[PDB]
Ligand binder design. Sequence first.
Ligand code: NI
Ligand code: NI
Ligand code: NI
Ligand code: NI
Ligand code: NI
Ligand code: NI
Lengths: 224, 224
Amino acid sequence: AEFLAKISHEIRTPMNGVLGMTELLLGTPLSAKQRDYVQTIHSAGNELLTLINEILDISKLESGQIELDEVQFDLNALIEDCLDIFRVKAEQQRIELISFTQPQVPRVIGGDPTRLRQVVLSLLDNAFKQTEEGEILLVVALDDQGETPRLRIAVQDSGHPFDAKEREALLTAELHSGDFLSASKLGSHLGLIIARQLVRLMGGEFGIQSGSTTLSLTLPLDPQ
Amino acid sequence: FLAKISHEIRTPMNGVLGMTELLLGTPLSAKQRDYVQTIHSAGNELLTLINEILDISKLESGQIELDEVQFDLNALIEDCLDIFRVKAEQQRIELISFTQPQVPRVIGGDPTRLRQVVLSLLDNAFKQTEEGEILLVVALDDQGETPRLRIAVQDSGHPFDAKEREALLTAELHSGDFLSASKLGSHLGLIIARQLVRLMGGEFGIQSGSQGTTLSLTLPLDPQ
Ligand code: NI
Ligand code: NI
Ligand code: NI
Ligand code: NI
Ligand code: NI
Ligand code: NI
């Protein structure tokens, strides 16, 4: 996990130029059809750059190069924010965003918001690509089961929930430098897997119960 | 190239390069042209790098197996040189090739990788030499206990250092140390080229005369 982080500059350096010219190109006199192409380089280039950025920092985390910072953040305000990106396209029918935050759960807890923001988004975004019609509910509750209260977050999948082989391969997902690029055909897109690894790093477990899927994450916490 | 870059890196970058090849068909100013010209000449660099990084990790891990089929040796070596002739005509370079009288027409092996290794060395020449002559000698080597094939590519080019020579022969990934970040970007395909030959069955070494650098592999020629 040192490697990708060690040579991070040279994976960044040309990509910084691709968007560098692009966010610069918009200022030039662009014709009607030209600007349609240049912004495509902007729009598609970023979603690859963020992917690149998203795989390097997780590569840094498994090495122990950097730490997940512990701060006290508004748990509900983050979740309701996570919904608001998807609520704008929730007006299209045959899907319904539902949020249930059990009254017992705290409003603020100690953890890392940004990396939790990804995992909640990555679990939520997967539900949209899965469901053609239906409704998606996100529960934020704590399961008192266990020696010490632990927080749980789950998202319910609409269709073809999981391959029996496919899920097991998700639970035992550990990716190295080259492994993050190999395009394993088994199929959990990069987005899902990176998301999975973090939820192991912060403690707790990942759970998917496929019933004809509820991508569940159970972070820990100390009772205070 | 024998490693499939991810479904989520290849296709966004596929759209970026698709624009640059398409955008030049549109009238644009000179200063505007360089911006799109680099994205083609730089967006490829990252895509070439991600593949190269991935290729080593697959060679070391052993997930790569070689075909055993009969191919025409002359065509392959003749076909590789046809690629570079257009790149060699502009560059003031005369590339020449000699194939010994004794080396056979057909040998059993893997023609797809052997092309890549021959492509790998042959590219390195043009990368590090101008004004010079590039030569490709194909000749069997009888010094071993049994006749073996060996292919030599040398350039009237600038030599390799004492440490870059040592690095190309010893450095490995998911191992001790890769020794560089800046220096590998150009010479990474040569390590890959070594990985095949070392797997192919014979040793691949480099002897740098202080000017011409000869990169020669020895492949185990078929029994009879
Ligand atoms: Ni650096
Ligand atoms: Ni922007
Ligand atoms: Ni399926
Ligand atoms: Ni896809
Ligand atoms: Ni091209
Ligand atoms: Ni390793």
